Amino acid sequence: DFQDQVAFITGGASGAGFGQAKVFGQAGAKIVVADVRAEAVEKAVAELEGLGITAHGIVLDIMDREAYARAADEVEAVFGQAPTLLSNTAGVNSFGPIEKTTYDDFDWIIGVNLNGVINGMVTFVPRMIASGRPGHIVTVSSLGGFMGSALAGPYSAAKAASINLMEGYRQGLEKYGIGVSVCTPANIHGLEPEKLAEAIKKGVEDNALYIIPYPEVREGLEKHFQAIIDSVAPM
Amino acid sequence: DFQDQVAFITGGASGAGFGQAKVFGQAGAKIVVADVRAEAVEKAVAELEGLGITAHGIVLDIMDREAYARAADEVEAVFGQAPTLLSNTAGVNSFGPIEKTTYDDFDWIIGVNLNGVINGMVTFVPRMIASGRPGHIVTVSSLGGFMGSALAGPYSAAKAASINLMEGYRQGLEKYGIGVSVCTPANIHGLEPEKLAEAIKKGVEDNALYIIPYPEVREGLEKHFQAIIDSVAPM
């Protein structure tokens, strides 16, 4: 189903990233674990090889644009082609009052949750297009992307941009047979990493723009959006 | 009404920024024109003084965090207090296919339309809180912030974050008697700069979170949001 697909997953040495590695791998995908913690990568790829998944590890801070370029070359060296599946799953956060936020807070959080995915898109999109192969791109953003918050202001804002940016790339890349999705988990008891992983693989198969596997949020999302619509001036 | 209010307006040497300078100034506000084009600032402040508005010019690239800090000091030197009204109105854009986007495209566009407003918020928010005075903060974002696009991908994404970030600061700053709004013009024949300016001044008075003076967009905005809601998994 995903046999002879290559998947590049950021923040894949853990959580949702790793869940994806496992789920896509069990479906036949060759996997590339990109994560910053070198020890965790080593562990994670081993555990994948232990599951009969062919897997390669790359230690990478996605905020480094040149290293992101090296990795992408590495991927073509190892598996003889550019990825056919990109997952920007890496994420970080810290809580606290939005007023108290500092430049370092911003740089770090915006850096991972937005700039990290931009670097991903700029790096791979041309290579994926040049391959002339069908492909797909997921970004694990957040539900907080749909609604700014006082305690996760920076994080929510960056996720708000990744959602939008995916909305944009979907339109751009359809003509290239490359689908685009964005997953918006409810992180504001809680959906398990493998559960969410299966939701993403389904979304990829369905070529869904949005992946929101949380029936409970519907009410609040409707309410947040109505407030906006209601703000629209008459007549 | 705005007598003895101080207003710091980015991208105020032109367009919506300048419109605001005029509108708020005619209402009694002392004005600070912050814009990068030194000649345009000079012209703009003159034209304001010509209208009986007390006005000071500051040449400033908002992407420079330290200069943004110098300006904020300058503002307190000149008018003997931190601003009581902040407007992040500065904006830039360039059209083209989202796939073709480059790092410089991103840095420039994200830099002005997002990082510029973050620098604004980080600079002034503490000073405004420390003043112990009521205040207000507007960001002129965009309607494209509510919907990502193939031809204005970077721009739309940054505006998507500023909207969200304002959504967040509103919640944070209410306890400080500081309101927050975001204006989302329809820039995707067209509302005049002074017309839009009056809409913002009304929004400031009303302490409205959203300022969307474009009755026509309602249908499309409803449609975009429903698509999201419809993506929410049953049950």
Numbering used by the authors:
A (entry chain A), B (entry chain A): 3 to 190, 226 to 272
Sentences from the paper on this structure:
The LigD and LigO enzymes catalyze the oxidation of the (αR)-substrates (αR,βR)-GGE and (αR,βS)-GGE, whereas LigL and LigN are specific for the α(S)-configured substrates (αS,βR)-GGE and (αS,βS)-GGE. We have solved the crystal structures of LigD, LigO, and LigL, which by amino acid sequence alignment belong to the short chain dehydrogenase/reductase (SDR) superfamily of enzymes. The SDR family is characterized as a large group of NAD(P)H (2′-phosphorylated NADH)-dependent enzymes displaying an α/β folding pattern containing a Rossman fold; this overall organization is seen in the LigD, LigO, and LigL crystal structures. The superposition of the LigD, LigO, and LigL structures using Cα atoms shows a root mean square deviation for LigD-LigO of 0.88 Å, for LigD-LigL of 0.70 Å, and for LigO-LigL of 0.93 Å, indicating that the enzymes display similar overall structural features. A sequence alignment of LigD, LigO, and LigL shows an identity between LigD-LigO of 40%, LigD-LigL of 38%, and LigO-LigL of 37%. In these alignments, the most sequence-divergent region is in the predicted substrate binding loop. This proposed substrate binding region is disordered in all of the crystal structures solved in the apo-form (LigD, LigO, and LigL) and in the structures of the LigD·NADH and LigO·NADH complexes.
A cellular pathway has been characterized that performs β-aryl ether (β-ether)3 bond cleavage using three sequential Lig enzymes. The first step in the Lig pathway is a stereospecific oxidation of the benzylic alcohol in the GGE substrate to produce β-(2-methoxyphenoxy)-γ-hydroxypropiovanillone (MPHPV), which is catalyzed by nicotinamide adenine dinucleotide (NAD+)-dependent Cα-dehydrogenases LigD, LigL, LigN, and LigO. The final step consists of a GSH-dependent lyase, LigG, that catalyzes the elimination of the GSH thioether linkage in (βR)-GS-HPV to produce glutathione disulfide (GSSG) and γ-hydroxypropiovanillone (HPV). Our structural and biochemical studies of the enzymes in the bacterial β-aryl ether cleavage pathway reveal the features important for substrate and cofactor binding and catalysis by these Lig enzymes.
